[PDB]
Amino acid sequence: KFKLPAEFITRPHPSKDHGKETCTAYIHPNVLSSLEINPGSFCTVGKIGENGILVIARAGDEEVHPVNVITLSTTIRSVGNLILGDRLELKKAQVQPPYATKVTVGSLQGYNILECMEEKVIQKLLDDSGVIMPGMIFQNLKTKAGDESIDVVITDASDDNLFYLSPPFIFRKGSTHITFSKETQANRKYNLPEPLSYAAVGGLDKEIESLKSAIEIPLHQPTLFSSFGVSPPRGILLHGPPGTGKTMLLRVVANTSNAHVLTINGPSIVSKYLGETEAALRDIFNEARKYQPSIIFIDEIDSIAPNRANDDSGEVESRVVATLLTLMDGMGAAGKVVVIAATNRPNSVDPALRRPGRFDQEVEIGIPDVDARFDILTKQFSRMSSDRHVLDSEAIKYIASKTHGYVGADLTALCRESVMKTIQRGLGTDANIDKFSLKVTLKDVESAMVDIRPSAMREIFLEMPKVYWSDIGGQEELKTKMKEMIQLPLEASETFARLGISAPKGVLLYGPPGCSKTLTAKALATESGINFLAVKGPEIFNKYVGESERAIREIFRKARSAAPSIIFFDEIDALSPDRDGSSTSAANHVLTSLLNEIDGVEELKGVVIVAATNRPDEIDAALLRPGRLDRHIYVGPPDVNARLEILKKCTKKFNTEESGVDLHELADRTEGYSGAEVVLLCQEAGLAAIMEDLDVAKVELRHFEKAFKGIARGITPEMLSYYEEFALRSGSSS
Amino acid sequence: KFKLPAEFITRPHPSKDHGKETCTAYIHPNVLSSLEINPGSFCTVGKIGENGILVIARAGDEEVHPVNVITLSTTIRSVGNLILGDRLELKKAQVQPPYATKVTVGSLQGYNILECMEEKVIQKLLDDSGVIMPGMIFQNLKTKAGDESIDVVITDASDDNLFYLSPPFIFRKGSTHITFSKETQANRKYNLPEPLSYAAVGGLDKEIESLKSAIEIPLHQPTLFSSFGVSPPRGILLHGPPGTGKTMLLRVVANTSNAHVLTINGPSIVSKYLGETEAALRDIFNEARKYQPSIIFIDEIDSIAPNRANDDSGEVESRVVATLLTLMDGMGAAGKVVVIAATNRPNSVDPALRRPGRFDQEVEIGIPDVDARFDILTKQFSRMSSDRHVLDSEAIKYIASKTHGYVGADLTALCRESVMKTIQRGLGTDANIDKFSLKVTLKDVESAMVDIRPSAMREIFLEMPKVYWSDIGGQEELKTKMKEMIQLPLEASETFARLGISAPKGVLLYGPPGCSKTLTAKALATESGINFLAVKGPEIFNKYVGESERAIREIFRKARSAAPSIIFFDEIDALSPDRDGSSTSAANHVLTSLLNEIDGVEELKGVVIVAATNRPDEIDAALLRPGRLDRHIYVGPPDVNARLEILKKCTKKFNTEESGVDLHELADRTEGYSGAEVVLLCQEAGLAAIMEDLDVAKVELRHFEKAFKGIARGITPEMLSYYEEFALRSGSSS
Ligand SMILES: Nc1ncnc2c1ncn2[C@@H]1O[C@H](COP(=O)(O)OP(=O)(O)OP(O)(O)=S)[C@@H](O)[C@H]1O
Ligand SMILES: Nc1ncnc2c1ncn2[C@@H]1O[C@H](COP(=O)(O)OP(=O)(O)OP(O)(O)=S)[C@@H](O)[C@H]1O
Ligand SMILES: Nc1ncnc2c1ncn2[C@@H]1O[C@H](COP(=O)(O)OP(=O)(O)OP(O)(O)=S)[C@@H](O)[C@H]1O
């Protein structure tokens, strides 16, 4: 008794697609007999659990075709997004689709179908197709010039449903109005599965290029590699943050290639007892060997190959890893098969799968930067941009600037929640709203992301508030010094590379606490015209595996790898103290990392290391001397006019001037109050404001008078003396 | 009711000769019945997780044949390289394999079969064989008149749904041509497993023969010891750094020796249920006793048999070690059983497990010598085709001498990376180039070696901007003496050896700050070729009771493992406080650990120490003693002719001579300057020049004139008199 397989395997149809064989997917005649299916008859082909698609049953050769294999012309696989290795469910159809009266025909790129190709050849393809559902493609179509490939998609067909993903219509010549259209997708109401192509993967062009090379080299041309007697780089591994296009990159690799896509599912490949896990792995790799070229995907390989050094690993992990070691290192030198693995983090995968010959090639998928978010946002925003009509591309930069932490996944969730808030905006404006009349808006998008948890954390990007050289409080002497000395060496970069001389290394920005110290570095991050970076004091300084001597190296590597940078070292004096008999901290590592990084082989073409301090006498002597820091200047608390404009800056939502006391009046009233202490006076006044009216009021002069009492003179002569004592040393050769 | 085994134990036939029993697998009657494998019918037997071998089933004697065992001939086992004790599946094949048309036969020995044997012999062998598959070896066939015996191999088989490891074919006398060949292995098309052999192991010759002796006598000649009234040595332990080839030895021992082969793959036996790990060990040793002779392998013994006295070893480790101890020497007997184990940490193995009677022998497997590395490289490169282009001896000998501290895994990685480099160069030439002819040229090996790191050196991070002797201005005396120390003793080894003289193995470079002290160490590092470990003064002054001495000892351990190597102790004055009043530092014992490591009860052969101090008399007389720091070199300030060379080096990208800037005047007027101050002079003149312009202003003598006005002489006459005084009491006749 012949046994009918439950699931059939999609595979190419060596016959051409231009013929009458569009929906005549050849089926093994034994299956045709065993399922009461007549030749040239319609039957439903579809993935498990999905709505069916219509194919015409045609008998194939018994010997050539194995029983399971079902061959589809490449026109119908694109209907239901049938990629190779997709298990099917053959069933017998019962209703013959009616003929067609109108068909709207699309194109890939919007090319004028009238101008490029004849109507006769298009009609020939369509008629010979016989039955047309919305969603196929007619490929490799020769044009009038003979050198252009334009593909005929079909947007819709109308005649003047259940368990069918789309209802076809039997295209017949004579009255079918073939009205060509610029739409690049099938009819939207049915929503036939959209391919996840390369143009939906934005933000990882370099990484996708590396992945493409790693897939092509073992997949298409392993023979010429194998002549050398050492196995190809079959094993590729993807790792990085657990939100950045990992499974999506695997899915696009599945879609684009024409290589038989197998899949090593994590949980479902394993049944029970013995000889089931190894049986599954053997069978799947053997099938990937029979049908070539093939890709073997292992998404989240960690869930089945932990280190065996953790209590998680049991018998099953030992089975999976042993079988994979036996297989992946055994096959080769002729098989056109690649194994691609991805993981949230790779470091917990058994090394036996990581040695060369096993997964040894790597693709690093990294956090998207501020400039990286633009492509993600715009391409994500494409699916309905015709109904956005709001972008104009400028809000996208703002979003990218304010989404430090989002990993692309959260950006897509932001799109989802924005669409929700647009639906609810339509409902709130009018209960019986028409959503299609709505264009999404940035205000409701803001009302949207104000209710999502952003991401894991922010690593190389900070708030970086907008500060300008046009607003920094007075101190035109400070301004002129910092310009002359930190922008000139950042201008002369090639002229140092030629003439062979290293560039000045950095400035230390002497000054008492609470000044514009780093708030000027905020302008460096806003209006310098040069990208910025910082570590706000002893974050990296702490004693951890990746902080003792590693995080400094990573920070410098990111900064140097970028365009010129003004890397910042807030309170370097407190970070690494003198440690020469006075204030001996226990780190001993971070200063060594800085010493080995700043002075060494690295290029550091576009890099200047700025730092900040309020107790400069505590800096390690290895920094003051030229070689690590060789520029040195002093920042003072704001002068009377700088204090005028800092007083202006403190207020952001108060009307003291017109109602109360002029801000201009306060300019000289504030003496001994540092840039972060005039803030203290203003904030004490603001807290006192909510004590008199308690709901809504201006402030009083006496509020600022109480600010004067409650906060004594901040900038006292002690710091003047301590500085000038240190400055007679720093300023002079002593 | 009868329960068929889930996995089956391989075993040999009692009959060693060739007949109609050859391709027959003797399976138990009940198992035959339960899979319905009717006697005489075809069945497939193959390791779990691999493709099967077709074998024709017979019955075993139901009372003396164990249920688990299938017995297979050496001919069949040669196909899949099935070692005795391998766990086989057994599955019915409802098939009749195809007839043969042309069968190819070869011989391991490569001798002409027409000359050695009569074709009727081969015809009879094949006819009786019943089945033909590529990969079969018919061993011990006698030559003409019994001259010798030859092994004959079925290299290929051709005929003009199950899946098999080798194609099954049938021999039908006369109608299938027995075509001879000289290929000593089966056709490479088939991916047949290829036996690993001792010829693939490099070096370790004496260790290999020790393994041969301790494997052969206990298993294959015990009555010799029973005759001599002594017990057999039932234990071998292999210890040595990782990557030296310990598992390779175990696999070759498994595949070469004719014995029941069992493996405890450390964590593979472990279970979370109370007594199951111990029960796995008992079953393994009882199986070894049952089928004799038997070899039991334990790779990483330390993973399952820890010290049993240390803190983390609780009751579970105690019970597992007790099981191992009692199964090796207890109230039970051993039999013809030998246990072979491997470990990277011999002292972490339980001390009572290494006593004679258990692991009697400890065959050390250490890092390779230059001869050993040459052997490994020749055997690795013998695996390739005639695309090597590395002269079998010369180029490989250069690569072997240039590899210092390599262990053997890294050498295989180097060969694979060389293949990678050659083929990426091929891709960079053109994508469609005929790669196979892209011989790996020695420069490809060089490009590969710069991208690999010796096993003993992954953790030795260095920035090391590739300093060369010519960078050091002058100092010809120091250069000559450092050539004496580092280079010559290896480039003239036989001369020193024949004179009975070991070259001095310590030097102290002392002199004012900013001379060529550290730069000469870096020049040695990046010109001597040998490894180079670096240390600094206060980086190894942890504040715990014994953590600094541990740093010293770890450094010297790595230096020994990576010898030839330099250890450069910059700021050796930090490591040498007397603490009696001279350098009254903390109560640390770093000096003593350094003293004992340099010259103690252990010898420290092969390492050379270079120490640099700018305060030479603050060093202990014991450390300056010959045998610790033999030669004391005074690296003083550069004289005029060295200054001129410095200026020529750094100013070459200036157009000084085209501008009339006479370097003679600069050299003469920079008298008594520190050489670092000469470099500073030129770099500061460059700053001055490129401060007037953002474009390239060629330096001018007046910018140098400005420079001279600021750079103070860092070397006072006091320092010079001090160092010249130390250069009289020590390292001088006085
Ligand atoms: N360039 C991009 N970077 C990141 N995500 C993107 C990008 N482009 C689109 N996305 C969307 O990101 C969403 C989530 O990405 P996924 O790859 O599915 O997450 P993941 O890679 O599975 O993460 P894990 O937990 O490490 S497996 C998808 O629905 C994509 O539509
Ligand atoms: N002559 C050789 N000596 C050493 N290794 C060799 C040699 N020839 C090849 N190799 C390779 O080097 C490795 C030797 O096996 P390894 O298991 O890595 O050594 P081992 O680390 O001492 O054993 P372990 O730690 O129990 S896995 C393998 O990857 C071999 O392919
Ligand atoms: N012949 C030379 N004499 C002195 N310095 C030289 C010479 N040639 C080059 N230099 C440069 O001068 C500087 C001297 O640096 P080092 O070699 O570290 O001197 P050093 O005496 O080891 O300093 P220490 O160890 O901190 S006391 C480096 O920038 C060298 O590149």
mmCIF file of C-alpha atoms and ligand atoms in Angstrom, chain A residues 196 200-204 240-249 299-300 342-344 368 376 380 407-410 412, ligand 1:
data_model
loop_
_atom_site.group_PDB
_atom_site.id
_atom_site.type_symbol
_atom_site.label_atom_id
_atom_site.label_comp_id
_atom_site.label_asym_id
_atom_site.label_seq_id
_atom_site.Cartn_x
_atom_site.Cartn_y
_atom_site.Cartn_z
ATOM 1 C CA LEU A 196 11.085 40.491 2.279
ATOM 2 C CA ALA A 200 13.523 46.359 3.175
ATOM 3 C CA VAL A 201 16.785 45.824 5.068
ATOM 4 C CA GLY A 202 18.152 49.348 5.088
ATOM 5 C CA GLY A 203 20.851 50.449 7.499
ATOM 6 C CA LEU A 204 23.191 47.451 7.066
ATOM 7 C CA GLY A 240 25.006 41.411 17.872
ATOM 8 C CA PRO A 241 22.292 43.218 19.837
ATOM 9 C CA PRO A 242 19.087 41.173 20.139
ATOM 10 C CA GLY A 243 16.924 43.620 18.213
ATOM 11 C CA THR A 244 18.828 44.443 15.027
ATOM 12 C CA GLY A 245 17.709 42.711 11.839
ATOM 13 C CA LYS A 246 19.039 39.237 12.655
ATOM 14 C CA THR A 247 16.140 36.934 11.792
ATOM 15 C CA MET A 248 15.133 39.499 9.176
ATOM 16 C CA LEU A 249 18.510 39.183 7.452
ATOM 17 C CA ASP A 299 18.126 30.829 13.936
ATOM 18 C CA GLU A 300 19.032 31.154 17.613
ATOM 19 C CA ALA A 342 22.433 33.674 14.177
ATOM 20 C CA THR A 343 22.382 34.359 17.902
ATOM 21 C CA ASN A 344 21.488 37.089 20.367
ATOM 22 C CA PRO A 368 22.378 51.663 14.335
ATOM 23 C CA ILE A 376 15.582 52.319 8.521
ATOM 24 C CA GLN A 380 10.091 51.283 6.918
ATOM 25 C CA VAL A 407 17.451 49.058 17.543
ATOM 26 C CA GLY A 408 15.287 49.176 14.428
ATOM 27 C CA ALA A 409 12.837 46.734 15.976
ATOM 28 C CA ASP A 410 11.637 49.413 18.378
ATOM 29 C CA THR A 412 9.052 49.396 13.678
HETATM 30 N N1 LIG C 1 17.907 47.785 9.482
HETATM 31 C C1 LIG C 1 17.121 47.226 10.405
HETATM 32 N N2 LIG C 1 17.639 46.970 11.626
HETATM 33 C C2 LIG C 1 16.857 46.409 12.552
HETATM 34 N N3 LIG C 1 15.576 46.045 12.458
HETATM 35 C C3 LIG C 1 15.090 46.311 11.240
HETATM 36 C C4 LIG C 1 15.773 46.885 10.183
HETATM 37 N N4 LIG C 1 14.951 47.008 9.074
HETATM 38 C C5 LIG C 1 13.807 46.515 9.481
HETATM 39 N N5 LIG C 1 13.819 46.072 10.777
HETATM 40 C C6 LIG C 1 12.703 45.482 11.507
HETATM 41 O O1 LIG C 1 13.169 44.987 12.738
HETATM 42 C C7 LIG C 1 12.166 44.079 13.216
HETATM 43 C C8 LIG C 1 12.759 43.170 14.262
HETATM 44 O O2 LIG C 1 13.988 42.620 13.770
HETATM 45 P P1 LIG C 1 14.291 41.083 13.949
HETATM 46 O O3 LIG C 1 15.539 40.653 13.173
HETATM 47 O O4 LIG C 1 13.071 40.325 13.603
HETATM 48 O O5 LIG C 1 14.665 40.893 15.470
HETATM 49 P P2 LIG C 1 15.651 39.705 15.761
HETATM 50 O O6 LIG C 1 16.767 39.942 14.747
HETATM 51 O O7 LIG C 1 14.945 38.419 15.563
HETATM 52 O O8 LIG C 1 16.324 39.830 17.189
HETATM 53 P P3 LIG C 1 16.872 38.618 18.007
HETATM 54 O O9 LIG C 1 16.148 38.582 19.383
HETATM 55 O O10 LIG C 1 18.395 38.817 18.242
HETATM 56 S S1 LIG C 1 16.636 36.898 17.120
HETATM 57 C C9 LIG C 1 11.628 43.374 11.971
HETATM 58 O O11 LIG C 1 10.214 43.227 12.044
HETATM 59 C C10 LIG C 1 12.041 44.295 10.806
HETATM 60 O O12 LIG C 1 10.918 44.721 10.042
#
